[PDB]
Amino acid sequence: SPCPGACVCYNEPKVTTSCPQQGLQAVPTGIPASSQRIFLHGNRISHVPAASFQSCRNLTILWLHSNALARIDAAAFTGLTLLEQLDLSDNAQLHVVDPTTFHGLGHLHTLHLDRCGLRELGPGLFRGLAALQYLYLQDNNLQALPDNTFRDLGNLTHLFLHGNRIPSVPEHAFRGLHSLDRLLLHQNHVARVHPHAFRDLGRLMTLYLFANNLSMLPAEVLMPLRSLQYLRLNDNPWVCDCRARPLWAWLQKFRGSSSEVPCNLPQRLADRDLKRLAASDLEGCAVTSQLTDEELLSLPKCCQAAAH
Amino acid sequence: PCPGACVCYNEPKVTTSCPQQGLQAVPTGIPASSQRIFLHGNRISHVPAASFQSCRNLTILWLHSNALARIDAAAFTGLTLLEQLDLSDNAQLHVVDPTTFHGLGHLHTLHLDRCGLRELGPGLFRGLAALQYLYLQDNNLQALPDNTFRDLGNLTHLFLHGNRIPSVPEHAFRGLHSLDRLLLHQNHVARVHPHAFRDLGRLMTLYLFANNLSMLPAEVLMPLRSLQYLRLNDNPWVCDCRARPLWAWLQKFRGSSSEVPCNLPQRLADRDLKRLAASDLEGCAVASGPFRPIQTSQLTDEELLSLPKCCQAAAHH
Amino acid sequence: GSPCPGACVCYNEPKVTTSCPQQGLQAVPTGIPASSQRIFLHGNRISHVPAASFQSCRNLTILWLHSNALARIDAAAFTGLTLLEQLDLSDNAQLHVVDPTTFHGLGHLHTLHLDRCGLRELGPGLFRGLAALQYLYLQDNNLQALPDNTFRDLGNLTHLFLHGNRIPSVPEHAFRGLHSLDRLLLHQNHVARVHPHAFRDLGRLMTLYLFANNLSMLPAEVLMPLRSLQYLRLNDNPWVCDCRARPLWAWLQKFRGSSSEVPCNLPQRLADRDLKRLAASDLEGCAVASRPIQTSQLTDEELLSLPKCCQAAAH
Amino acid sequence: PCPGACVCYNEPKVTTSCPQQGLQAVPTGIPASSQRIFLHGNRISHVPAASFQSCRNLTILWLHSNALARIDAAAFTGLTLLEQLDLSDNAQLHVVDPTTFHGLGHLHTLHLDRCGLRELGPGLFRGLAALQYLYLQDNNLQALPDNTFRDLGNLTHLFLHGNRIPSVPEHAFRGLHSLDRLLLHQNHVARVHPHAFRDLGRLMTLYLFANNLSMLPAEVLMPLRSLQYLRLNDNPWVCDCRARPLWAWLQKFRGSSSEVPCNLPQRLADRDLKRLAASDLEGCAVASPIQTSQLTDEELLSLPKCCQAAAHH
Ligand SMILES: *[C@@H]1O[C@H](CO)[C@@H](O)[C@H](O)[C@H]1NC(C)=O
Ligand SMILES: *[C@@H]1O[C@H](CO)[C@@H](O)[C@H](O)[C@H]1NC(C)=O
Ligand SMILES: *[C@@H]1O[C@H](CO)[C@@H](O)[C@H](O)[C@H]1NC(C)=O
Ligand SMILES: *[C@@H]1O[C@H](CO)[C@@H](O)[C@H](O)[C@H]1NC(C)=O
Ligand SMILES: *[C@@H]1O[C@H](CO)[C@@H](O)[C@H](O)[C@H]1NC(C)=O
Ligand SMILES: *[C@@H]1O[C@H](CO)[C@@H](O)[C@H](O)[C@H]1NC(C)=O
Ligand SMILES: *[C@@H]1O[C@H](CO)[C@@H](O)[C@H](O)[C@H]1NC(C)=O
Ligand SMILES: *[C@@H]1O[C@H](CO)[C@@H](O)[C@H](O)[C@H]1NC(C)=O
Ligand SMILES: *[C@@H]1O[C@H](CO)[C@@H](O)[C@H](O)[C@H]1NC(C)=O
Ligand SMILES: *[C@@H]1O[C@H](CO)[C@@H](O)[C@H](O)[C@H]1NC(C)=O
Ligand SMILES: *[C@@H]1O[C@H](CO)[C@@H](O)[C@H](O)[C@H]1NC(C)=O
Ligand SMILES: *[C@@H]1O[C@H](CO)[C@@H](O)[C@H](O)[C@H]1NC(C)=O
Ligand SMILES: [Cl-]
Ligand SMILES: [Cl-]
Ligand SMILES: [Cl-]
Ligand SMILES: [Cl-]
Ligand SMILES: [Cl-]
Ligand SMILES: [Cl-]
Ligand SMILES: [Cl-]
Ligand SMILES: [Cl-]
Ligand SMILES: [Cl-]
Ligand SMILES: [Cl-]
Ligand SMILES: [Cl-]
Ligand SMILES: [Cl-]
Ligand SMILES: [Cl-]
Ligand SMILES: [Cl-]
Ligand SMILES: [Cl-]
Ligand SMILES: [Cl-]
Ligand SMILES: [Cl-]
Ligand SMILES: [Cl-]
Ligand SMILES: [Cl-]
Ligand SMILES: [Cl-]
Ligand SMILES: [Cl-]
Ligand SMILES: [Cl-]
Ligand SMILES: [Cl-]
Ligand SMILES: [Cl-]
Ligand SMILES: [Cl-]
Ligand SMILES: [Cl-]
Ligand SMILES: [Cl-]
Ligand SMILES: [Cl-]
Ligand SMILES: [Cl-]
Ligand SMILES: [Cl-]
Ligand SMILES: [Cl-]
Ligand SMILES: [Cl-]
Ligand SMILES: [Cl-]
Ligand SMILES: [Cl-]
Ligand SMILES: [Cl-]
Ligand SMILES: [Cl-]
Ligand SMILES: [Cl-]
Ligand SMILES: [Cl-]
Ligand SMILES: [Cl-]
Ligand SMILES: [Cl-]
Ligand SMILES: [Cl-]
Ligand SMILES: [Cl-]
Ligand SMILES: [Cl-]
Ligand SMILES: [Cl-]
Ligand SMILES: [Cl-]
Ligand SMILES: [Cl-]
């Protein structure tokens, strides 16, 4: 019954404790235990200690974005077995989340972790979140997409990873994401997508890969994407020589929608859209042609053969 | 001995035919060997259990356009050779007992349109594994519960237009793996659950026009691999970020579709979603709640929760 | 109506019951309470069951009509009885025939007693749609055949009683559909042969009675689908212990379950020997029905109708 | 820092051990890195959600032989690395909230015996796909609801003896396809549904002794293809017509079984059913001494089907 001074409390449609943008630097004491939704966003809260909301057993929505979170205790969400939506975004100094923090939240549907200065995704961080549908991880400081990071997320439909520093997509980065509809990887440092990286993405409808470091994309990697409707590939250093031939053909047959695929090399094809190129425009190796054998091994197969 | 108000003959099937004779009840003395009985266009109001009990070989029963107020739950129990049952155009019938069709394993067509039906009780279509045509249009249905058609694995046609169905839950159409044509137009459909059409891999025609769809998840169309024709006009489509998945689906789809006219935002009013470019679909156009012409920036976080996810993303950043 | 019929006793516990057995009733009594869940009319002298004889008793689950004087059952006798679970029509020896559509629509029927009803045949469609049926009693009738697909809808049937009839053989598809059958009683008939693959659908069968019949041989291959077999009775059959008995002999050696004795009727040298206890070398040559008649003097038509090993013999 | 009543050490696993210290509450200050906690033999009465919340890596929790009156539904929610949970010998616990074990997808053993349990609530064992050992013996259970163990695809041992289970319904043991050992002795089991053991194809050992079975359908034993040892003694077996299916099964079964002593009729008292001949099983021995001929058709409805046949002849 006693509502905290910084807060407004009401009962319909859900029991709500709302205290946003009140300059709070700590979670207010005396939050009604029957709260189903708690809005603490836009304050200056620095920490989330253990069991900060433990009495609110019926909590389904916890809003904590745009604070000054520097640390979240691994036991911060004790008691919140029914939590469905958790927004922790826009806390640029958070940097790290203990890998066990979200454990046991089997009702979680939405998790906002964007703009949290996250340096890495720890092992087990998203384990057990079988009901999760939306995962926001964009605009962090991620430098890797480790294998099996999303392995338990069989119900995930939306995965937002744009605006990090992801250098590549390993084979099993997206293992287990059989329900994924939308995958956004634009504005990273992706220089390559491993073969079979999209093996589990039979339901994917939308894939953004623009503003990355791709010089090539084997058509074979796109072949599991049988539900694909929309593909974005612009602003990549595409090399339109022999290595572009598979992607070129795939683009000709694909009935969905796609962006331009502008050539960056060779110079004679600069600013040409690959989709509009004739097959005979794709010749030789672009990369100076005589190289070290170790460097020759690092080039596409058609370049190694073009030397011969 | 043929009833006075009737005409009886034996080929091609034993038939008792007495339509539009102003009959106040089912006539007595219908030949027990009857296979086809045409009693439509009369003034019959009840069908007790004993009415057709002697007609063991009955396969076709026509009772449409009568004055049916009631059908006994045991009216057809022993008549399991029944193949076609037309009970339509009896507007005051209002309700059919959920056990009325149990055991009719040879039934192929069931007409229940224009019967003022208020609801489909649990188990109404249970066990009808041979049913091919089901007419339920122009009734007073206000709900399409999960598993209503669970056993209709052989149904090819399902008519549901002209009711007041407000939404399609996830398992409303579970089990309909033979369905070819599904007509849901002229209802109040405001939303379709993303996996509502999971079993409709053979569906060729789908009507959803004249409803209340502000958006349709492209995900719900994805299982419709046999789809050839899709009707979507006369819905209040919102052509903002929420329309992006459907927009892409419409570009790739090789079958035929109606226009998808944008209702909001105003700058895109009467534009066709099919003809829009991706860049046209940016941001959020608030089409729900009180204070109806409103900017997303003016909405609390709590208010944003009722909007599409992509609207929430647009408002915050 | 709600008052109890004169010849009856009515009570509510445990189920609403109308009980009028052995009252000398010649017809179904009027005024049986519509709320009846159970009706006992056995041991009277009821001569027929006309259309809708109990149609108001919508909650009826048990209808007892055995040991009456039924000469006819109207095809629509059981109108209204959608919830009927146990129907006992047994011991009406002058009934002779049931209209093939009489039980149609009785989807809750679990038990059906039709034994000792003088039944001359099982009409096409007689047991159609009885998906819940578990017990079917057909013993001590006058059945002269088991037509194909007679039981094809009886997927939940566990007990089938057919003894004391005049069934002459078991055709290939007689028992199609009986995937749940546990006990099959076929004794005291005239079974001269069991068609190969006749037991194809009886993988759950635990008990098979074939004694007091006219079997001269049983291919071991016909028993092979019976993976659940526990008990097999085969006595009182004119078993012929020649070359034709070799497969059954081998089967009996390996069989881990229980079986009766299998007494040899021919040849005379092995008369009344138990096939189970014979050595394989005791099984030789071919003994035709018949002084023993040689294969050598037989017609080719007759020869073709003998077991394969007999045809091979003397050839 | 190790709590005064405890001993703490690192190898082989980080362990906090404080058993039999007369503790009335879970000690505060248990090291967060604890993988194993031994608090058995104390007098602990409550387990609030906060108790073990900081022990994120907790794998083994021993709480047996305490005074538990209550376990909070959120007591283990975040501790999803739990593999062994021993809550046994807390006779006043009586109820475990149906959500208590949700999300424990690494749980391998769960001890709930001697907890005075009155019921198993819906969803109590939901999602425990890793569970191998489940102890539920010596409680106060009066029913085994359908689908109680539906998700326990990896369960090998299930102990249910010493309860008051009156019957086994058709789908009580649905889902238990890895089950090796099932102990149901010392209950009140009067009947087992014919298809109750449908999913128990790997079952090797079945204890049904000290119950109230007057008969057991052979049909229920048929799917038990791996069965090796069956205990059936100390039941009031009726060796009349209703025993014929079990009689035959007993003749064919090549694993081991206890004696199956007849309780009725008097002429076969204390005889082993396994040793009887088929001719010894005839007619109906009515539980009362009442003749079969004297029985009304109404009364016969509550008897085995073969008794109805033996009565009417
Ligand atoms: C949660 O909701 C339930 C059901 O309305 C209620 O009984 C319970 O008291 C609530 N819990 C809290 C902590 O308010
Ligand atoms: C995932 O979504 C499906 C519906 O698509 C739902 O039935 C299921 O309960 C959800 N959760 C899990 C763990 O499958
Ligand atoms: C990736 O591309 C950016 C331009 O968008 C460039 O500045 C950067 O050096 C590239 N990095 C690598 C590793 O190629
Ligand atoms: C129904 O059809 C069967 C077979 O054609 C026939 O024997 C019977 O007389 C017909 N009529 C009735 C009322 O059963
Ligand atoms: C469905 O229809 C086909 C022919 O259209 C038929 O062969 C099949 O038996 C029907 N299925 C059922 C379950 O009756
Ligand atoms: C649906 O739209 C029609 C016209 O477009 C309107 O008359 C009706 O009120 C709407 N229904 C709902 C529930 O908003
Ligand atoms: C059958 O039982 C139902 C519910 O017990 C009752 O409402 C109904 O009146 C009964 N029918 C008759 C004919 O008594
Ligand atoms: C047949 O038996 C199965 C197994 O007990 C049961 O689930 C099913 O409901 C039964 N069928 C009918 C029609 O009663
Ligand atoms: C059937 O067996 C009996 C044995 O009592 C025998 O009398 C009868 O002739 C046999 N029937 C045939 C057709 O051989
Ligand atoms: C759990 O173990 C990991 C190492 O696997 C360690 O980094 C972490 O600090 C441990 N957690 C606690 C609360 O001790
Ligand atoms: C079940 O057991 C198998 C074999 O021991 C194992 O591979 C599997 O991981 C187990 N399941 C779980 C959920 O641990
Ligand atoms: C079996 O039931 C009887 C009374 O019905 C009871 O005395 C006996 O203790 C029961 N058996 C067991 C093992 O509890
Ligand atoms: Cl609440
Ligand atoms: Cl804010
Ligand atoms: Cl903290
Ligand atoms: Cl959500
Ligand atoms: Cl993104
Ligand atoms: Cl999408
Ligand atoms: Cl390729
Ligand atoms: Cl792009
Ligand atoms: Cl170009
Ligand atoms: Cl290449
Ligand atoms: Cl070359
Ligand atoms: Cl008309
Ligand atoms: Cl009128
Ligand atoms: Cl009526
Ligand atoms: Cl329609
Ligand atoms: Cl069509
Ligand atoms: Cl979608
Ligand atoms: Cl349209
Ligand atoms: Cl149009
Ligand atoms: Cl506008
Ligand atoms: Cl347009
Ligand atoms: Cl964003
Ligand atoms: Cl009698
Ligand atoms: Cl009659
Ligand atoms: Cl029999
Ligand atoms: Cl049996
Ligand atoms: Cl034959
Ligand atoms: Cl053979
Ligand atoms: Cl025998
Ligand atoms: Cl001889
Ligand atoms: Cl001998
Ligand atoms: Cl042969
Ligand atoms: Cl140590
Ligand atoms: Cl102890
Ligand atoms: Cl351990
Ligand atoms: Cl023990
Ligand atoms: Cl035990
Ligand atoms: Cl049995
Ligand atoms: Cl024992
Ligand atoms: Cl065995
Ligand atoms: Cl066995
Ligand atoms: Cl003995
Ligand atoms: Cl008894
Ligand atoms: Cl009696
Ligand atoms: Cl029995
Ligand atoms: Cl008998």
Side-chain angles (χ1 to χ4, degrees), chain B residues 103-182:
Chain B
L104 301 183
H106 294 272
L107 195 64
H108 292 138
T109 69
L110 178 55
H111 286 80
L112 285 166
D113 53 291
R114 299 157 175 87
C115 289
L117 293 191
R118 303 189 179 108
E119 74 164 25
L120 308 169
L124 184 57
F125 304 119
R126 185 239 277 168
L128 301 177
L131 197 65
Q132 286 165 337
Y133 278 77
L134 176 51
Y135 302 84
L136 289 161
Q137 68 269 35
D138 297 331
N139 281 294
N140 200 21
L141 299 177
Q142 300 192 63
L144 215 57
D146 284 333
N147 305 317
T148 293
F149 310 101
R150 192 211 302 269
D151 294 345
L152 310 188
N154 261 22
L155 201 74
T156 55
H157 294 68
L158 179 52
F159 304 98
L160 283 159
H161 95 266
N163 285 285
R164 288 192 290 141
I165 302 152
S167 67
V168 180
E170 182 180 11
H171 303 301
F173 297 121
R174 158 138 64 194
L176 294 170
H177 56 254
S178 295
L179 199 61
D180 290 328
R181 173 169 297 248
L182 173 54

Side-chain angles (χ1 to χ4, degrees), chain B residues 169-248:
Chain B
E170 182 180 11
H171 303 301
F173 297 121
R174 158 138 64 194
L176 294 170
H177 56 254
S178 295
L179 199 61
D180 290 328
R181 173 169 297 248
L182 173 54
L183 308 191
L184 282 157
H185 55 289
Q186 290 166 20
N187 276 282
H188 292 349
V189 180
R191 64 181 162 179
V192 174
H193 182 284
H195 299 146
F197 301 149
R198 169 158 283 151
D199 289 351
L200 307 186
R202 295 198 67 90
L203 197 70
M204 293 185 302
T205 297
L206 174 60
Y207 286 8
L208 284 170
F209 71 93
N211 272 293
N212 296 96
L213 293 169
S214 60
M215 73 170 287
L216 193 65
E219 176 62 20
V220 81
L221 295 179
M222 288 311 303
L224 303 184
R225 68 165 192 276
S226 296
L227 193 64
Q228 290 159 14
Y229 188 29
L230 177 62
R231 291 250 250 140
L232 297 168
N233 206 314
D234 193 14
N235 279 285
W237 299 108
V238 179
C239 300
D240 58 4
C241 63
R242 88 194 71 190
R244 289 177 308 194
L246 175 62
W247 171 83

Side-chain angles (χ1 to χ4, degrees), chain C residues 119-122 141-147 165-169:
Chain C
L119 290 190
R120 294 165 176 155
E121 104 274 347
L122 308 177
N141 278 295
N142 200 21
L143 299 188
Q144 286 183 141
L146 280 183
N165 282 288
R166 294 192 290 121
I167 298 157
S169 70

